[PDB]
Every structure is written in structure tokens, then in C-alpha cells.
Design a protein around this nucleic acid. Sequence first.
DNA 1: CATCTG
DNA 2: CAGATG
Length: 327
Amino acid sequence: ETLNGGITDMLTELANFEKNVSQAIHKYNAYRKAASVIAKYPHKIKSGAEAKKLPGVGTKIAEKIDEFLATGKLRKLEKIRQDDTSSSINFLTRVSGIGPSAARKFVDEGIKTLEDLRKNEDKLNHHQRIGLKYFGDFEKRIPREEMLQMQDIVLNEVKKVDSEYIATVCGSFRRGAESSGDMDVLLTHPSFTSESTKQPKLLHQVVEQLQKVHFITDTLSKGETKFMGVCQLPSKNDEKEYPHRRIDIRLIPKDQYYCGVLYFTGSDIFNKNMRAHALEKGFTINEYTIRPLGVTGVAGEPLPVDSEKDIFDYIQWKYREPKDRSE
DNA sequence: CATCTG
DNA sequence: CAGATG
Ligand code: NA
Ligand code: NA
């Protein structure tokens, strides 16, 4: 956690680059388990040889750790941090819609900067385009002060459309966090479930409303169950308009809400721990449901849930207020 | 995993 | 449809 930091970090630097720049998924994947192992390793790595001992620990990595431990740097890491090409990919990538794949193409085309991008706005797709339009806005964190404002609107409109909808703002917003990055709304309707054959409108209906009122501004992507968009808090009294915020709306059968809800709330750590105990207490948890574990190895069947309570209950545990859902 | 593109 | 992005 601090004993093998530099090492683990460099490796991550190394792993990152392999995938994003080069296409080395194997290599990439190498640096990964490696840092993962040195990550848990209880001692102070004092040498390559020492490390090499570890699994995932090859000679090349060793080699690397040596130079690092040996000198406070790594030549390769040094070359890469310069390499404008590498750099470019790292950057171009910040743009929503631009993955690495994309990144390489543009670069080999010579599109390297933000300006490069505008000049060639033709070459980008819609997402890619919104992404560009709101680069800053996008990168700007979201303050709970505004978070509550957003929540307010969304929830009110969802109400008007149908009294039977159930919306929920999951995320760290939900775990108390002072600022979030984007807004995740989980949605269900009684009339929707596991077996219940579809009802897209169920999602489309609200989408429309939010745009109606101008909350939603653009569409990133819009399917039958997941909407990816852009929204905005109505600039009050002209002087201070809001930033553009990322927002997702997703439909879920009412029959697997809370699990989702639980799940989307996090944190990853809470989940795990909650997930493990689940296992102890003779159960299973995942994104959509909790199931009684069979002894034959495993087994299934939908445990019926009406709240985040019912879940915990099953695993006989203390209801955790979302704030303390931290770890 | 669900959506988009081409 | 394989493939990319979130
Ligand atoms: Na991107
Ligand atoms: Na292939």
C-alpha cells in the first residue's frame, strides 16, 4: 500500500501505455497482474530477483524493477513521457467518444490537438462531437449543491409523467459525496419486470419530458433501457449559466431494482465485503439479484426483494445507511 | 453490457 | 455483422 508504491505505479504506467499506444493487450495485461501481486506483497522489494520470485513476475519486469530500484527512474518510462505521439493519444482520449482506437487513427492523420479536432469536426461522430463541444464542462466535477438541484428536477418531472415510477440517484451522491462526476439515475416502474415483455416507452417517456423542460440537452445514445446524455441546470438570472453535465438514465424491471440500486451505490469495497459475507451467510449477489446458495457447488433461484433492507436481512446484516456504505 | 457505426 | 466506447 506504500511499501511497493513506485514499483506498482511504474508498472501501471508501463501497462497503461502498452494497451493505449501500442496495442499490446498481452503486455498490458502482464504489467497488470504483476503490479497486482507486488501490490499485496507484504515486504519491501529490495531487488528484481526478489520480485521475480513472485508469480506474474518475469525476468523483464524484474529487469525493470532493477533499474528503477537501482536509479530513481526508468529510461523507457522516460522516453514515453516525452514521445509526443504517446502523449497525443493520452489526450485525445480525454474526449468523450474517443477511445484509444480512435485516438491512434486521428493521430496518424495528424489530428493531435483540440484545435486539430475542431478543424476536422467532420471526421468525428455525434458523441465525439458533443464530447468536443463540452470538453471542459465534461471534465469539471459536480458539486452536491447542484447535485441536489438536478435531483430535484428529475424527480419531480418523473413524478408528473407517471406516479408509479421510481427514480433513484445512485452513485457517491447517494453515499454522501461532496462532489460527483456525473449523474446516475436508476429507474423502474411496477409495470416492468423480469418476465414482463418490454415497454421501452417506459424509458422514452421520461426522456422526452426532461428534454421538454430543457433539462436534457443532447443525446449521447438512446436505447430501450439506457439513455446516455447531457443536461443542465437552468441558468437562473443570466450572468451565471451552468456547466454541461453527463447523465444517464436506465430502466430496470421493478423486480431487480434494489439490488441494482444497492449495487450502483457502492462503493466497490462495500460491495465486495457485502458480497463476501453474502457467500458466508449461504448466498449470492450480483448486479440483479440475491440467490440462496446450493451446496452441490452452487445453485440458484430469485430471492424476493422489496428494499435494500430485504437484501441485507437475508445475509443477516446491519442495514447500512448509504453514507456508511463506504467500505 | 448496451448502443452506435460503418 | 465485428468492433468501439462508456
Ligand atoms: Na474518450
Ligand atoms: Na477477431
